[PDB]
Amino acid sequence: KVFGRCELAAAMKRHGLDNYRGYSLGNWVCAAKFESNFNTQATNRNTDGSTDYGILQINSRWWCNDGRTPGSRNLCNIPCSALLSSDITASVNCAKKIVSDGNGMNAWVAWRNRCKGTDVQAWIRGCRL
Numbered sequence: 001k002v003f004g005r006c007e008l009a010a011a012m013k014r015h016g017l018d019n020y021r022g023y024s025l026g027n028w029v030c031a032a033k034f035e036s037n038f039n040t041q042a043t044n045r046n047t048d049g050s051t052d053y054g055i056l057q058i059n060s061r062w063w064c065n066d067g068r069t070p071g072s073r074n075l076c077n078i079p080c081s082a083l084l085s086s087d088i089t090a091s092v093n094c095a096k097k098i099v100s101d102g103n104g105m106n107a108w109v110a111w112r113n114r115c116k117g118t119d120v121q122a123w124i125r126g127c128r129l
């Protein structure tokens with residue numbers, strides 16, 4: 001599923017990401033845009049053999065199990081494929097655990113480089129939330 005900007009914003013808010021750990025909704029929509037282009041089926045292979053999954057490109061090195069990242073962790077107690085669902089519940093819940101580990105949203109490289117410092121509010125502008 002490829003979300004609309006506002007549709008994703010609505011779904012994320014509904015799951016309580018708006019100002020979660022002090023990150024306003026626009027941050028999350030911004031991160032989703034540059035990580036996955038709002039596409040829940042997005043996958044990307046990393047150099048170390050791990051793989052990023054879903055709309056927030058969550059990495060199998062620590063956060064999910066994909067059966068081919070040896071010696072990794074599954075801190076979100078999920079199969080990585082669950083992060084590819086059209087329902088973003090799993091990705092959101094896992095994101096909440098990631099953003100809580102002490103490094104905030106800097107865990108998403110796309111957010112740090114493309115969202116951090118900018119007017120993230122622009123990403124939910126025009127949306128009925």
Ligand SMILES: [Cl-]
Pocket residue numbers: 056057058059098107108
């Ligand atoms: Cl991640």
